[PDB]
Amino acid sequence: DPKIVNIGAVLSTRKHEQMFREAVNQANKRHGSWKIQLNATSVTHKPNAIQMALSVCEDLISSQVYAILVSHPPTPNDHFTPTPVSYTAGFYRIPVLGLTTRMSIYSDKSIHLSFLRTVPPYSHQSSVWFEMMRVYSWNHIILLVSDDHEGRAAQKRLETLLEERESKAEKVLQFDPGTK
Amino acid sequence: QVQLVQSGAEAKKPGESLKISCKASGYSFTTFWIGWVRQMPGSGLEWIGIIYPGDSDTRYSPSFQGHVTISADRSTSTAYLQWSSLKASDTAMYYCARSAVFDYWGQGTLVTVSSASTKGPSVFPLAPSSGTAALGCLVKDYFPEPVTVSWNSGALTSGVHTFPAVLQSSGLYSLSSVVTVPSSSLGTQTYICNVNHKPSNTKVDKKVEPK
Amino acid sequence: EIVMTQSPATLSVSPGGRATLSCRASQSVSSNLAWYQQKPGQAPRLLIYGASTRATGIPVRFSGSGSGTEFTLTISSLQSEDFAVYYCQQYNNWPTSWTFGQGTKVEIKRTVAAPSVFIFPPSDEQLKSGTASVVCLLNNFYPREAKVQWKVDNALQSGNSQESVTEQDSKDSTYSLSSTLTLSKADYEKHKVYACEVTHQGLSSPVTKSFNRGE
Amino acid sequence: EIVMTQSPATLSVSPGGRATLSCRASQSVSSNLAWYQQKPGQAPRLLIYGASTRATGIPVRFSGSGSGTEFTLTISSLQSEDFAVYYCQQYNNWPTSWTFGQGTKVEIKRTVAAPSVFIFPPSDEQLKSGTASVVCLLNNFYPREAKVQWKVDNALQSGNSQESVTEQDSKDSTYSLSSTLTLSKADYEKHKVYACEVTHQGLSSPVTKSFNRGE
């Protein structure tokens, strides 16, 4: 009992709050209570961007957390919250976990330091592009792609996988983002 | 900083139902795997039951199922132990421990299941006059165990003795508490032995005086 | 459903030695062991869990080791306020198993000593009630093996006396037996010579403390 | 040429505790040392030489440690037979130095008790020689620190009273004190009231025993 770890979290809605608590209780109902006793604290979302970093610092790091959780807000903004929390907790190399954010830039341990997520990103589904096209007697591609980082990463992944077949696509022409 | 005070002693004839408490304190009650163990006279310890007081999840020993039903309550943390009925061959002592590697045990609360009836203890003083200081209080025939003694309301601990009682001829038990002290202090300090038989709720104080 | 084996049974070490208590499983339990100490007239405590780690607030004299089978606990520099009954237990399938052991029992070894003898007659309240008893008691001797005999009216009578022996004290390891003689008021009044006979190696001769009935 | 400092000057333990003494080294005296036990009126023995090895025939409690800097032995679980004077002694350049120390002293501990005071006047046989002696006896007290005063006609006297203290008995661990007042018949016949007043930690008030000549 004297050892007490302090896993924090950052969820979306207050109700999920309760869920989180009950979850961690199960993690103690089965595993032991001598050198452990995981203690769970959390916070809820804010819209003021820099307020995210300020709040996460002041609240979550004041309780010497060990690994923060992160999830998308109820209203979508593509990136929103993982960037501030990722940067702030990456100052001290405190590993965080993603829960929904499947966008491809994060999977680069040079601009995000420490970030482990639990859903494969968009780019990985490129593999399914291959396997399916491998089975339905097809060997030709005219793929389009955006110019954003997501498109670049997806096209590079597909080309790297496909060049193993000693083959290549026909055209890789890319349009500018937000075109009319 | 955890105390697991149990309830007082209990003795009753076969047939009735029992209820004893293990009220805890000093820690967040709904997070630890309280259990129970039983010890019969001079054989060792065995396990009976265990209960997580957050979901009332329970489990039982290979052969104890249905005899005793464990419970819980999140108002004073008291984890009871419901006894079905009878179980005459159950004279033993029951401990309640805490954390599945059991750490913080409590007191003892022996449960007596016999056919006789409780009888109040009979105390007897001793008169010292020899020149070598030694004196005590004797507890004559009584039933049932246990019983506690203490001198001057626990103001004297060095040199105290308290023998194990034995059943002589009539199913009752006899005790004998002896103690020594500097000889010159015999006629200058008042001695009292405190006897408290919990079953019969008897409490007498036989003051002793020099012969 | 896992039997437990603990040997030896009555280890006896000199009060500076050590111990090598053993507790062997019946299967391969990786690391799920715990050791317990229980002093007489008390409730046990925890001192080792995991077969290698120490609990909180436990001196350094204790330490354990072992895996699979043949678990060992080694008390270093056995102090005086030891002499408690020990136990070993395992918890693999938990919570389902909780199988204990039987455990050994240490017993410190001392140097021979000589006991005193004191006696007490009835207290005139038991005499008023008609039930009389005279008690003779010893103090701080060793070992426990001793013979106590009565003498009523310069005659050895039996069948009416009972004796009790405590456990070894926790400061100097000395038993102290007591013995009691019970008889009716008339049976006590039939004689006026009472004494207790004590025979032991500690004392040179069987000292006796006779009581002369003179009220 | 090296002074051994032995501390503490006088310890005291309960029968079952431990002990820890010290032989302060004024220099780095290699790794050679010794530890000696001596009871009153007897020839000392040998316990540890080289500060780490046990001489044959010595029980296992005694052990020590040291590396040329205030070595130390720890008698664990001091029984009744122990508790006499100790000594430390070094040997570095031999045969040249052979420097001993001062050594500590161990006494048993017990609960406080009160003394019994007695007074003995001259028996008229010593008085026939022109000398008078008055004896004040303190019996079965604890601890040793106490004060005794002589009052001749309620007057303090100095330089004419002698004191003797016995040794701690192995049974009840007390002390017995005698105080004698010796004087000539000329001083004896000039005074009538004599008083012996004791003051002691275990006594509520300074208690006096007095007598008068020819009564």
* Residues in Cβ contact with A35 at an 8 Å cutoff, skipping those fewer than 6 apart: A3
CB-CB neighbours of B153 under 10 Å: 9
- Yes or no: say if B197 and B110 are a contact pair by the CB < 8 Å rule: no
Residue C205: what residue type? S
Instruction: Return all residues near B84 (Cβ < 8 A) that are at least 6 apart.
Output: B17, B66, B67, B68, B69
DSSP lists the bridge partners of residue C119 as C136
Say how many CA atoms lie within 13 Å of B24 toward its Cβ: 25
Cβ neighbours of residue A87 closer than 8 Å, sequence gap 6 or more = A53
CB D13 within 8 Å of CB D109: yes
Instruction: Give the number of C-alpha atoms closer than 13 A to the C-alpha of residue B48, restricted to the C-beta side.
Output: 22
Would the CB atoms of B100 and A32 count as touching at under 8 Å? yes
Chain C residues with CB under 8 Å of a chain D CB are: 14-17, 77, 79-81, 110-111, 113, 170-172
| Joined tokens for residue B56 | 């009332």
Which residues on adjacent β-strands are paired with residue D209?
D196
Q: Which residue of A has its CA nearest to B99?
A: A33
8 Å CB contact between D191 and D153 = yes
Nearest chain B Cα distance for residue D155, angstroms: 30
Give the torsion sign (CA, A13, A19, A25, A27).
negative
User: B184–D111: do the CB atoms touch at under 8 Å?
Assistant: no
Bridge partner residues of C181 (DSSP): C134, C161
Contact by Cβ (8 Å): D197, D151: yes
Q: If residue A25 lies in a helix (H) or strand (E), which one and from where to where?
A: helix A14-29
Give one DSSP letter per residue of C151-215, joined into a string. EESS----SSEEEE--PPPTTT--B--EEEEEEEHHHHHT--EEEEEEE-SSSSS-----EE---
Resolution expressed in Å = 4.0
Q: What angle do CA D5, D8, D9 make, to 5 degrees?
A: 85
SS3 state at B114:
coil
Experimental method, per PDB record = cryo-EM
Are B31 and A28 a contacting pair at CB < 8 A? yes
Token pair recorded at residue D7: 């501390």
Task: Report yes or no: C135 and C181 within 8 Å, Cβ to Cβ.
Answer: yes
CB atoms within 10 A of CB C88: 26
Q: For C2, which residue in chain B has the nearest alpha carbon?
A: B62
Beta carbons within 8 Å of A160's beta carbon, 6+ residues apart: none
Tokens of C189: 């009044």
d(CA D100, CA D95): 14
- Provide CB contacts within 8 A for A31, sequence distance 6+: none
Three-class secondary structure of residue D23 per DSSP? strand
Distance CA A56, CA A42 (A): 10
**Amino acid, res. B96:** C
Tell me if B182 and D116 make a contact (CB, 8 A cut-off): no
Question: For residue B160, what are the CA distances in angstroms to B76, C69, D142?
Answer: 37, 44, 20
For A164, the 3-state DSSP assignment is helix
Q: Do chains A and D touch (3 or more CB pairs under 8 A)?
A: no
Beta-strand relationship, C147-152 and D207-212: unpaired
User: How far apart are the C-alpha atoms of A1 and C57, rounded to whole Å?
Assistant: 14
Q: Can you tell me the distance from the alpha carbon of D111 to that of D99, in angstroms, rounded to the nearest whole number?
A: 39
Helices and strands per DSSP (H, E), number in chain C: 2, 15
Query: Could you tell me how many residues make up chain C?
Result: 215
Q: Which two tokens stand for residue A154?
A: 């997806």
B9: closest CA among B211, B171, B201?
A: B201
Closest chain B C-alpha to A33 CA, distance in angstroms: 7
d(CA B26, CA B32): 12
Report CB contact under 8 Å: D114, B158. no
Helix (H, G, I), strand (E, B) or coil at A157: helix
Return the SS3 of A123: helix
Neighbours of B15 (CB within 10 A): 10
Q: Taking chain D, what is the end-to-end CA distance rounded to the nearest angstrom? A: 63
Query: Burial of C190 by CB count in 10 Å (0-12 exposed, 13-18 middle, 19+ buried)?
Result: exposed
- Long-range interactions of D183-190: CB distance < 8 A, separation 24+: D183/D131, D183/D132, D183/D133, D184/D130, D184/D131, D184/D132, D185/D127, D185/D130, D185/D131, D185/D132, D187/D132, D187/D152, D188/D122, D188/D127, D188/D132, D188/D213, D189/D213
Question: Which chain D positions have a beta carbon within 8 Å of C16's beta carbon?
Answer: 59-63, 76-77
Amino acid residing at A10: V
Q: Does B185 touch chain D (CB under 8 A)?
A: yes
Scan for tokens 């280890």, then name that residue. C11
Q: How far apart are CA A84 and CA A80, in angstroms?
A: 8
Measured between CA atoms, the residue of chain C closest to residue D63 is C16
Gap between the Cα atoms of D180 and D165, Å rounded: 12
- The rounded distance, in Å, linking the Cα atoms of B173 and B197 is 12
Minimal CA–CA distance to C167: which of C190, C194, C144, C195?
A: C144
Q: Nearest-CA neighbor of C54 among A34, B106, D18, B28?
A: A34
DSSP secondary structure string for all residues of B20-59: ------SS-STTS-EEEEEE-TTT--EEEEEEETTTTEEE
Helix (H, G, I), strand (E, B) or coil at C126: helix
Four-residue CA torsion sign, D185, D190, D191, D196: negative
E strands in chain A: 3-4, 35-36, 68-69, 96-97
Distance CA B174, CA D126 (A): 60
Pick the closest to residue B178 from B145, B203, B144, B208 (CA basis).
B208
Residue D22's nearest CA partner among D58, D64, D57, D82 is D64
